[PDB]
Amino acid sequence: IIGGHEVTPHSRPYMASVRFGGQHHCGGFLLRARWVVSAAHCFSHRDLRTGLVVLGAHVLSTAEPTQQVFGIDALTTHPDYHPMTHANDICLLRLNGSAVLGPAVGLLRLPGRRARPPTAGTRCRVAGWGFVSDFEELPPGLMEAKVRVLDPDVCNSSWKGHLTLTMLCTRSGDSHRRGFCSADSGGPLVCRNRAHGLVSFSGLWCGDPKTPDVYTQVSAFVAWIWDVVRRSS
Numbered sequence: 001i002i003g004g005h006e007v008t009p010h011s012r013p014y015m016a017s018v019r020f021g022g023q024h025h026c027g028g029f030l031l032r033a034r035w036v037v038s039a040a041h042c043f044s045h046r047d048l049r050t051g052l053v054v055l056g057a058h059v060l061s062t063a064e065p066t067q068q069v070f071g072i073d074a075l076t077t078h079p080d081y082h083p084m085t086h087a088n089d090i091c092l093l094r095l096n097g098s099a100v101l102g103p104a105v106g107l108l109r110l111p112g113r114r115a116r117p118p119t120a121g122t123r124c125r126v127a128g129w130g131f132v133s134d135f136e137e138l139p140p141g142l143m144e145a146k147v148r149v150l151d152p153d154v155c156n157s158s159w160k161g162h163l164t165l166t167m168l169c170t171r172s173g174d175s176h177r178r179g180f181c182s183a184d185s186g187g188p189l190v191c192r193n194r195a196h197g198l199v200s201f202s203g204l205w206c207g208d209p210k211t212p213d214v215y216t217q218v219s220a221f222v223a224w225i226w227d228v229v230r231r232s233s
Ligand SMILES: *[C@@H]1O[C@H](CO)[C@@H](O[C@@H]2O[C@H](CO)[C@@H](O)[C@H](O)[C@H]2NC(C)=O)[C@H](O)[C@H]1NC(C)=O
Pocket: 049, 051, 052, 069, 070, 071, 072, 096, 097
């Protein structure tokens, strides 16, 4: 996360750390005790059994008592996720067990089915354990940045018309570079206490205004998410 601050340890309990080969790879969120929502691209060319979902963490490197580590029993990627286009960059993860709810391991709510994406200007927040700059610099723990929803017609121009109706953008509330970076994918864009977006792609350099931060418009997927969840009891 660029242009962000470190969060109060355990102040965002829904945050999941998807890790492959010891190293933290992506972000995600706890939907239900057994379910985690993430970016479909995180699992591309990975063997699931090399992966763990870590909940209740702040300093990922430290083995905290608050931490709860689970395996991926099953991964449901959006059937229509397209590499090259990056559309439908969403997936669901069924853990090998249910997470024990506590003050450090908690749920995040999706918008209703009756939901349009947040308006251009809306104050939103993006958390993650990914890089803090374009120099591979690591955060001291879970970081968050305060962002504001950017007009899609504006975002689509910057992106040379590569944006689909199921994507949504952010921009910093000021002149500084604020947003997501590498290893922040899958993590949620919280708007009005609901997961409105999910960290998908950005340009080359982090928070660069010329290439605004693109997210998956969660509301457009709510129906699918539940379908999958009720499918697997
Ligand atoms: C859930 O999945 C994980 C990953 O497949 C299981 O793996 C254990 O994880 C620890 C480290 O976290 C390893 O040292 C053990 O060797 C792994 N055990 C097994 C059985 O592979 C984890 O055990 C699973 N938990 C449950 C309750 O099934």
